[PDB]
Amino acid sequence: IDWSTLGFSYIRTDLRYLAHWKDGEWDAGTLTEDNQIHLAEGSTALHYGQQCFEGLKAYRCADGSINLFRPDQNAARMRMSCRRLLMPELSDEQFIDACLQVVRANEHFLPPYGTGGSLYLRPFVIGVGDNIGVRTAPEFIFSVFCVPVGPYFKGGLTPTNFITSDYDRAAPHGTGAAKVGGNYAASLLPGYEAKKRDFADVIYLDPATHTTIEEAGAANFFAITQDGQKFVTPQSPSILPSITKYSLLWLAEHRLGLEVEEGDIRIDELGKFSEAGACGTAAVITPIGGIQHGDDFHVFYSESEPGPVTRRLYDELVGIQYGDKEAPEGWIVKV
């Protein structure tokens, strides 16, 4: 109701989309009001961690129209998750369609242009059915629910700090690059410890020889060279391939005129970048004040303000989302 004090917490919205896959196929799908999910006490979703999901948003423009930011990329990636866990995939039709039904029905829950709100969509897939063994499963449920949400862990483009961990949230040859609940389960601990010290989160390093940056179990990482000319994100099979990263990495080259590089970043060489931040749907480029790596707090630009490049990447990206700045063809679906 009040978009002022709106945060990234849960809120029950009128209706949500639901569909079952049994005997080789998905039902037509329908909007329900249940809010609760019902599954066997032996469901693979509960014991063996066979679950996957997405996070996309819907924004309200100053024209009246509703924007969807690259839904096609979300549908795409889930197919990737679904695979990794022997789960049936969903077409870009059943997906975008779901999201559209779940926004149209809950349209009154969409924050109006002005306040930085947005309608978050959490599409998820879990294996159900009676079972006990370590196999896939006889059935599945695909659901899409939304909640009005403002900033995740930021505010007004204001920066925030991060600290490294000893723990690994994803393995070298694991599901680290898939949005499957497993990865996150392993982040809770190191992430909570990271919060008890008034930090934003935790930046995990390569599983093996923790020497280079991965991401933040909540968003990707990206810095900028001192001569503020190059945009950089680490490349690693273990990090989730963010729609936002790949997007930022796009404007970075064609709209802001910057050199771009996907490659390694040593925690041993932070002073190579002038300003750094994390990115994501709920993350939405978040200035990174400093990084603690033991006896070492490293501050790029300001700890109270964002760098100029971080702001340009923000104002451009966010414009596209709310329809303030012409968006590349193909991105953003009207509603």
Ligand X SMILES: Cc1ncc(COP(=O)(O)O)c(C=O)c1O
User: What residue ranges bind ligand COI (CB under 6 A)?
Assistant: 55, 133-134, 152, 218-219, 280-283
DSSP classification of residue 212: B
Considering only residues 44, 160, 233, 242, which one is a binding residue for ligand X as defined by CB under 6 A? Answer: 242
Q: Give helix 243-254 / helix 71-84 axis angle, nearest 10°.
A: 140
Q: Give least dist CB 243 to ligand COI, A.
A: 9
Choose the contact partner of 168 out of its own copies, ligand COI, ligand X, none; CB within 5 to 8 A by kind. Answer: its own copies
DSSP lists the bridge partners of residue 277 as 222, 287
- CA pair distance 181, 187, nearest whole angstrom: 10
- CA pair distance 335, 159, nearest whole angstrom: 32
Q: Residue 31, exposed/middle/buried by CB under 10 A (0-12, 13-18, 19+)?
A: middle
* b/e 276-307 (16+ beta carbons within 10 angstroms → b): bbbbbbbbbbbbbbbbbbeeeebebbeeeebb
- CA pair distance 10, 267, nearest whole angstrom: 35
Which range, of 9-17, 110-118, 214-222, 317-325, touches ligand X by CB under 6 A?
A: 214-222
Q: Residue 228, exposed/middle/buried by CB under 10 A (0-12, 13-18, 19+)?
A: middle
CB closer to ligand COI, 56 vs 223: 56
Residue in the block written with tokens 């923000």 = 314
Choose the contact partner of 243 out of ligand X, its own copies, ligand COI, none; CB within 5 to 8 A by kind. Answer: ligand X
- CA pair distance 129, 123, nearest whole angstrom: 20
184 annotated as belonging to a binding site for a ligand: yes
| Total site size for ligand X, rule CB under 6 A | 13
152 annotated as belonging to a binding site for a ligand: yes
For residue 319, which amino acid is it? G
Give yes or no for a contact between 19 and 143, defined as CB atoms under 8 angstroms apart: yes
Q: Give least dist CB 100 to its own copies, A.
A: 19
Residue 118 interacting with ligand X (CB under 6 A): no
Choose the contact partner of 298 out of ligand X, ligand COI, its own copies, none; CB within 5 to 8 A by kind. Answer: none
- CA pair distance 205, 288, nearest whole angstrom: 16
Give yes or no for a contact between 39 and 125, defined as CB atoms under 8 angstroms apart: no
Choose the contact partner of 85 out of ligand X, ligand COI, its own copies, none; CB within 5 to 8 A by kind. Answer: its own copies
Q: Give least dist CB 258 to ligand COI, A.
A: 23
DSSP classification of residue 112: P
Residue 218 interacting with ligand X (CB under 6 A): yes
Residue 240 interacting with ligand X (CB under 6 A): yes
CB closer to ligand X, 26 vs 167: 167
CB closer to its own copies, 89 vs 261: 89
Give yes or no for a contact between 169 and 187, defined as CB atoms under 8 angstroms apart: yes
325 annotated as belonging to a binding site for a ligand: no
Q: Give least dist CB 118 to ligand COI, A.
A: 10
Choose the contact partner of 215 out of its own copies, ligand COI, ligand X, none; CB within 5 to 8 A by kind. Answer: ligand X
CB closer to ligand COI, 163 vs 279: 279
CB closer to its own copies, 176 vs 307: 176
Q: Give least dist CB 217 to ligand X, A.
A: 5
Residue nearest to ligand X (CB): 244
CB closer to ligand COI, 49 vs 55: 55
- Annotated binding residues for L-glutamate, as ranges? 48, 122, 134, 152, 281-283
